[PDB]
Assembly symmetry: C4
Homo-oligomer: 219 residues x 4
């Protein structure tokens, strides 16, 4: 039966059918949003869901037999696996995080469709030639995070009272949002020289990002 | 008589004339802005308009006789057509949107005048070589927008209570405007881990944007 | 005496002497800032000023004889002229704008010093290959400015009540500062669809700027 | 004994060891952050430090015997030296800045480990090819900063009352943070034409930045 199924799986109809449901479940997912819709076509959409997740567990299985090991060696397939799976976990139990993560299946439309793969693949290909800098950067953030926690965490618990808060705050400063009016001016009301810690931080971080762009925009 | 008019339309004078009015009606639109001016040279400006729109329909007509099918197949002429059409719709009836959309006729100056066309043209040419990425992003937004609606729409109606509500908010976060002080810090007061949803969102959406720039910078 | 002076003007000492005063007047200009300093070395700096402006009117004259017409054909010289001049206008009369514009002389350090000229020159050289786009852009701003004035100027006098206010506000939106939390969200409290006017405006304006960078970053 | 130690220092083990401690002291610094951890494994962490600093001076010494002059001529070694020196200064005395600056020893990991060096190196290499522009800008800031101080420092002490006050503010405006709502709109309530000072400032400073990026992107 191998080749029998293998001709179904590898068939055009198959894919087109899968891509069709993606877009359907996709559209249906946006109505599941409407408080109203849920009172009318409420159940219809609920059943349509269990159906789709079924059809997808089938599809994902059939695909495995037809590919065996090569499947759990395919980035794109693994995704579909670890996404249909999350959608399988009981509607109840634990937390509803998983219940929300289900919408992650609409990402399957990147899988099932060529071109999308190209871009995604094209985008991701660059990540490697960035890790050297990213590492540097993280180290930087880590060092300043620590310094900031022990410099302003006392009188500014909210933004620097913790190693992790400082991280968050420094990332904000990196995106340059409300960094002056919201963080550094207030800070300076107690530590006149705080500007000596942030302006430099902004330069380094800014500079690095600028180069990182140059790289990707050349290398 | 064809060639007769075809020598009028196709002439230099003709174009130069149309361009003269554009820049004239243009200067007029900016005065029609002033409350004061409308109390003095008020009507002078009102009639002047009904005149231009006429002269512009005549012109648009003449051009169609001189081009027949070719006219309704030229982007630039089409624009000129639509823009004149709008301006034609009665000052009254329906909503005043149209009444405002009239000022779109000053975009006519991009049409009538070469060079502008070149730049506009040079710009639009890049668009198609982005669509693959623009689609990816849009899918992305749709997915996270749906997630956000069901993750914070209950306690934060204004920013995520609706699917479109969330789209707007997320776009804001993408432009990085007040993203931390304005939206994420406040959100975290109820959902400590919301930073797990937005920081990653910020990275992905930023990365893409950076790449996109590169593409256009190079490709 | 021509060659006599011409050898002084063209002399090394001359320039070095001029560049020396620039830096001196420059340094002295930053102390003229201090409320305190003005009570101590107050007059000293005041006289030192009249002296420098003298020495500079001399220098500027000597330079003219040695160059005649070629002088008022030299961008760099013209500057020095139209800057030493402003500094000549009476400390009183009219308004103190001119009294502040005097600090513009420290710009002479870009003049008197090679290398600086290179960069400046290098920077300015690009402006030309940007005017096509800049023109387009301005037209755009003008069109939207007008539309906005007649769309929100009524209930939002501060930000759109005038053609010029709208300009200012739109530039702000272009820099993306407080555009959402400060302008569009408030706006939407009265005009639910305002987002249909600004998001597009942001895209066009953003896109254009992105290209303009590509150009300068290639052309 | 020279070669003896020269084989210790120059050895693999040696380096790997130093690197092991870096990452160790590093992890320690982040715990020394926690108020809780300091109440439990408190001293364990305190002694651990005084140990590393020792081992690091020994190491820094050994390296100097093995390199003599070459040591105080290598950027990376110099850094390592200075960073250890700081860490050496008594926990007490003077201000606790030093006490915090100690965490700068985690930058040691950029030194000890190759690759990091490469990136850091690759980054710093670009710096010199910017100085001409960096100087221009700095001159610019100085000039406008002086102007702003005497144009708004009286009615706006917090942002322009001082020469350095104005520097900070202007830098803020350059990063474009809250520049309109935060500073210029408020300023305009007293000085209607202040937009004439800032918009141009924004353009010039932006242009430069854009070019600079280009330079580094290409040159």
């Amino acid at each position: 039966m191998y080749l029998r199924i293998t001709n179904i799986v590898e068939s055009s109809f198959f894919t087109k059918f899968i891509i069709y449901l993606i877009v359907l479940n996709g559209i249906t997912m946006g109505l599941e949003t409407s408080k109203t819709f849920m009172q009318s076509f409420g159940v219809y959409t609920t059943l349509f869901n269990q159906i789709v997740i079924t059809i997808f567990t089938i599809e994902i299985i059939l695909r495995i037999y037809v590919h065996r090991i090569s499947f759990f060696k395919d980035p794109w397939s693994l995704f579909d696996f670890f996404v249909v799976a999350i959608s399988l976990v009981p509607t109840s139990s634990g937390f509803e995080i998983l219940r929300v993560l289900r919408v992650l299946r609409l990402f399957r439309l990147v899988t099932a469709v060529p071109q999308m793969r190209k871009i995604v693949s094209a985008l991701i290909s660059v990540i490697p030639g960035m890790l050297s800098v990213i590492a540097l950067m993280t180290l930087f953030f880590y060092i300043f995070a620590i310094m900031a926690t022990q410099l302003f965490g006392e009188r500014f618990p909210e933004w620097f009272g913790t190693l992790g808060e400082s991280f968050y705050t420094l990332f904000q400063v990196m995106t340059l949002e409300s960094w002056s009016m919201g963080i550094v001016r207030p800070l300076m009301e107690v530590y006149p020289y705080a500007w000596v810690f942030f302006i430099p931080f902004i330069f380094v971080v800014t500079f690095v990002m600028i180069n990182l762009v140059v790289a990707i925009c050349v290398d």
